[PDB]
Design an enzyme around this catalytic site. Structure first.
Site, PDB file in Angstrom:
ATOM      1  N   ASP A 197       0.818  -1.197   0.000  1.00  0.00           N
ATOM      2  CA  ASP A 197       0.000   0.000   0.000  1.00  0.00           C
ATOM      3  C   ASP A 197       0.863   1.262   0.000  1.00  0.00           C
ATOM      4  OD1 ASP A 197      -2.624   1.518   0.659  1.00  0.00           O
ATOM      5  OD2 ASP A 197      -1.310   2.067   2.329  1.00  0.00           O
ATOM      6  N   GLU A 233       1.378  -0.823  -4.940  1.00  0.00           N
ATOM      7  CA  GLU A 233       0.316   0.104  -5.272  1.00  0.00           C
ATOM      8  C   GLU A 233       0.883   1.483  -5.528  1.00  0.00           C
ATOM      9  OE1 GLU A 233      -3.786   1.141  -3.074  1.00  0.00           O
ATOM     10  OE2 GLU A 233      -2.084   2.449  -2.605  1.00  0.00           O
TER      11      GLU A 233
END
Ligand SMILES: *[C@@H]1O[C@H](CO)[C@@H](O)[C@H](O)[C@H]1NC(C)=O
Ligand SMILES: [Ca+2]
Length: 496
Positions: A197, A233
């Protein structure tokens, strides 16, 4: 890091957004395994801040308090149980790893966490890890506010706080080891990979150092020497100093340009048309296919919380969404991720949804269970897009044509296109304001095929449309612009 580690034959993973571990374990055995799904992406399994204002929003899970497997999704036992049961059925588990930061710097100190762990954002104290003021780069950030103010400065984008989130000093060996300790715990449990993330907010070099500390996959389920699947990401829509290609050395990257462009084409914005999808992929400026993780929408941009904007298609746009997902699953570019959401009370005030923070279906904070209705759909407000016939059947379509080249392309210069995958599959689309009726070359073997969009192949018969392919591979297709699903798909395993 580039291989998903899925079982041979499975080509997609589904994001079961905010699902409970117990529900995912059941889903693995009762549906994912039998329907051919390769794996599941789960919400962050580590302890996060409990926010009551707004009431338990979905984004509270992106504000870590510790690395304890304790969340609204379940505890460590239930998590371990889920990974074991899913693995035993050939369905892998990928974890959303939130390692760039901890919680917001303005969050109140105390025990308002999902597992009662104490934390003090103000003094940078996270004893359950443990982390202290020396583990954050407050003295490293050079902006006046301490937050990221300009994305044109690659440095502050990496060393400063993303909207207040305490930024971890990922260059310190101690911090790197604490994160690896967390990831190795998950790897030894049985997870096959991770989603890093906010990777754009981390230095490619710091990520590499962490990955270098990770173990090989559990030898009880995976072959010796197996490395965890890694997809970073990174939201790179161009125009920024940071490029997703800078992270190629660590693993795959999320291609956010994929869904954004697919949405504008399907919606026919800016004069775009489906006929332009002829050279879809690298030809559109996307990252190389072997480094891409694609999707139509994600938990972020499906609520206008991420990159893509207003062009992103979601379950709310049912008809167009099914077509977009269908094209993605039929096209050979990248590794596909299917989305599974829940419904919330969308409320647009000034072109903006003021209820975009609403968390998963719950009862006073306790997430509701995923109930399966007689028609296989879900209840309790879970959308379960992965259970939609049109989507589920396309997931299988990708498995059946895995490895087949892209060929027999056809388009009417407008929004009526078609293409096949070697001799294992063929798909036709009609997004024009008129009907489609034409004889196309499918490259498929002669015979009667069941259209997997409108129906299913059940007991040597089709429940929906039937297609008849001749000896030379030609077949007639008829799609009215009024059909519920403006597209037809058939493959080797749907033949009668
Ligand atoms: C297909 O269904 C029809 C009845 O609708 C039946 O005559 C036929 O035997 C079925 N074919 C098979 C292979 O079951
Ligand atoms: Ca950072």
């Amino acid at each position: 890091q580039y291989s998903p580690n899925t079982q041979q034959g499975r080509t997609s993973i589904v994001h079961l957004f905010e699902w409970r571990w117990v529900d995912i374990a059941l889903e693995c055995e009762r549906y994912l395994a039998p329907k051919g799904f390769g794996g599941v992406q789960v919400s962050p399994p580590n302890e996060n801040v409990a926010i009551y204002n707004p009431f338990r929003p979905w984004w509270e899970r992106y504000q870590p308090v510790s690395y304890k497997l304790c969340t609204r999704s379940g505890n460590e036992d239930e998590f371990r149980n889920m990974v074991t049961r899913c693995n035993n059925v050939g369905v892998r588990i990928y974890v959303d790893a939130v390692i760039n930061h901890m919680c917001g710097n303005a969050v109140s100190a105390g025990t308002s966490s999902t597992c009662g762990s104490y934390f003090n954002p103000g003094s940078r104290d996270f004893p359950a890890v443990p982390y202290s003021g020396w583990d954050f780069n407050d003295g490293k950030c050079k902006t006046g506010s301490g937050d990221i103010e300009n994305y044109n400065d690659a440095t502050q984008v990496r060393d400063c706080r993303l909207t207040g989130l305490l930024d971890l000093a990922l260059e310190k060996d101690y911090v790197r080891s604490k994160i690896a300790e967390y990831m190795n715990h998950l790897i030894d449990i049985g997870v096959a990979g991770f989603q890093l993330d906010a990777s754009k907010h981390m230095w490619p070099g710091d990520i590499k150092a962490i990955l270098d500390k990770l173990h090989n996959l559990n030898s009880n389920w995976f072959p010796a020497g197996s490395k965890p699947f890694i997809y970073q990401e990174v939201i790179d829509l161009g125009g920024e100093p940071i490029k997703s290609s800078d992270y190629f050395g660590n693993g795959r990257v999320t291609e956010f340009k994929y869904g954004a462009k697919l949405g504008t084409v399907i919606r026919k914005w800016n004069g775009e048309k489906m006929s332009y999808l002829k050279n879809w992929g690298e030809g559109w400026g996307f990252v190389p296919s072997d480094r891409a993780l694609v999707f139509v929408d994600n938990h972020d941009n499906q609520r206008g919380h991420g990159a893509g904007g207003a062009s992103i298609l979601t379950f709310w746009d049912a008809r167009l969404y099914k077509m977009a997902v269908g094209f993605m699953l039929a096209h050979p570019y990248g590794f596909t991720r299917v989305m599974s959401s829940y419904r919330w009370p969308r409320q647009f005030q000034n072109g903006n949804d003021v209820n975009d923070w609403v968390g998963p279906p719950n009862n006073n904070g306790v997430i509701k269970e995923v109930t399966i209705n007689p028609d296989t759909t879900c209840g309790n407000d879970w959308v379960c897009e992965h259970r939609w016939r049109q989507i589920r059947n396309m997931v299988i379509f990708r498995n059946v044509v895995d490895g087949q080249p892209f060929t027999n392309w056809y388009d009417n210069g407008s929004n009526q296109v078609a293409f096949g995958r070697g001799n294992r599959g063929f798909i036709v689309f009609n997004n024009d304001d008129w009907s489609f009726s034409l004889t196309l070359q499918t490259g498929l073997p002669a015979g009667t095929y069941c259209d997997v969009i409108s129906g299913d192949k059940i007991n040597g018969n089709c429940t929906g449309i039937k297609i008849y392919v001749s000896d030379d591979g030609k077949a007639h297709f008829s799609i009215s612009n009024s059909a519920e699903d403006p597209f037809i798909a058939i493959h080797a395993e749907s033949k009668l």
